[PDB]
Amino acid sequence: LPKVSQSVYQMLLNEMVPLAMGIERQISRLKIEEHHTVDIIRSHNLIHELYKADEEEKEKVLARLRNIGFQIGLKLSELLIFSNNPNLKFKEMDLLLIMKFICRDVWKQIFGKQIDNLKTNHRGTFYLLDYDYRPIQSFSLEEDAKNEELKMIEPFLEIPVGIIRGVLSSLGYSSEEVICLASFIDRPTDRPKTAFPKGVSFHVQVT
């Protein structure tokens, strides 16, 4: 079956925060393509601009990238249901089976590795813990400025949240009862020290 290179995919999947930030500039470096002078701006410039723009524009870009991830997850859902053919139902009240499916197949198809262990409230919310989080395994600023790194690298945590939201959509629960938040609160228990120090945690709320 046809394939495409993981490197170009990983880079493209990384690079929407500059897209989601520059679209805002166009809504609210000169050069000529053929006859008319278009303007282009770098990626790290827009990452820093998002880091220090202001709160409402930051929230707008966060919801922007959440919409992108929602589309991706919702739209890849039907493909995964066709191909893998799991044992789910349309609105299964057993959230554990849905979360097992997302942990086993969706992430195996998007990223290269199965997601790590998960908590089980059995009543309300769930936690999804990822270690070393492939797309941003090669990000950094400085030897000392680690505090700014985690605050600047925040919006890149949205596209998997959007993926989870979208996969839950078109599988029963809509985007009015479900909310999810990403964070770095996961700590490396005993794993080998990779480039990025902190794993990520997706806290998923479903009533």
Binding site: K75, F82, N87, F90
Partner: protein, 140 residues
Amino acid sequence: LRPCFVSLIDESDKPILIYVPNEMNDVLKYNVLSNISLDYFESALVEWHSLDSKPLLKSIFQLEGVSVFAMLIKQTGLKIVIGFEQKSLSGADDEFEAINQIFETVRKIYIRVKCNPLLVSGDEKSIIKSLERKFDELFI
């Protein structure tokens, strides 16, 4: 082994599309058959697959010279129901598998058209036209 009508219904019993592959009152009859058919998915008369994680096919009923077959997609709530004639069937396993092959072909068409990343959010006027174009392209 042409189909007399093809019906796609979503989770909410909103009929997505009840195409007839061209009498002036035929779409009427096929709609009545489809509406009668849509109930059996929530019926204890026949046990659905619930095994091996595969869409399982059954012959649901048959009225007034139209053999109607159906699929419930467990993991999405999509419902496919398409008809066939008495006078174009033999009933052996080879045809029972060929009609199944037609079923996956139809579901490919629906996936492809709904998967087009230019549908704005929910435009039924666009979805219906695209599905109708694909069905015309196939059955002709």
